[PDB]
């Protein structure tokens, strides 16, 4: 049961918008294709895949009841990357840089969630 | 095997140093590994592989006799990428940007090659 809230509008028009523009965001635009990319254990490890394109479409179609759910999807996206990849891989550093911006934006979000 | 020349020193400390720091250079730091990257037709199509890491190592180990060899290795690297990939692939647009900077620095290289 979705919902439109001040916070979900902020997730869509500030958080996703800002991250999409970042030069490190492109590995996260689409779901990880483990066969195309030769990642044969990916779905054995990552059972809850998530990507920013999915998050964007979920916001655009009022999938979420609360911005907390959208923040959880972002956390799943980042942590899936942290788990699957090795602690020193470039993609982990890219994810960490995007998560830093994500947390900076979340900190400026309206702290009270109200339906529109 | 090789020697020091003013043009090779320029290739190392101007051309390669600049290109190595460029935002688009990272796909060219290492030989294309057609096994790890799942490129089963790469060596069918590309018979003379080259990459910037190999070029940089060759300069550091005084492998080259003349800068003409180093410039041709860059040409082979870039040309291979255009032969293998689609003109719409992002890697080809990255190669284009890098090749323009390469030719810019080449134009300002010392025009007469002397041994150092």
Numbering used by the authors:
A (entry chain B), B (entry chain A): 32 to 147
From the paper:
Bromodomains (BDs) regulate gene expression by recognizing protein motifs containing acetyllysine. BDs are small alpha-helical bundles found in ∼40 human proteins that mainly regulate gene expression. These domains harbor a deep pocket that specifically recognizes AcK-containing peptide motifs in both histones and other gene regulatory proteins such as transcription factors. To begin to address this knowledge gap in an unbiased manner, we carried out mRNA display screens against a BD—the N-terminal BD of BRD3—using peptide libraries that contained either one or two acetyllysine residues.
Because of the limited solubility of the original peptides, we synthesized analogs that incorporated two glutamates at both the N- and C-termini of each peptide to improve solubility and facilitate further characterization of the peptide–BD interactions. The glutamates thus improved solubility at the expense of affinity. Two copies of BRD3–BD1 bind a single peptide. The acetyl group of AcK6 forms the same hydrogen bond with the side chain of Asn116 that is common to all characterized BD–peptide interactions. In the second BD, the hydroxyl group of Tyr12 forms a water-mediated hydrogen bond also to Asn116 (inset). Instead, Leu7 and Leu11 form contact with the WPF shelf of the AcK6-binding BD. These residues, together with Leu8, simultaneously interact with the WPF shelf of the second BD. Finally, we note that side chains of residues N terminal to AcK6 were either not in contact with the BD or did not display any electron density, suggesting that they were likely not well ordered.
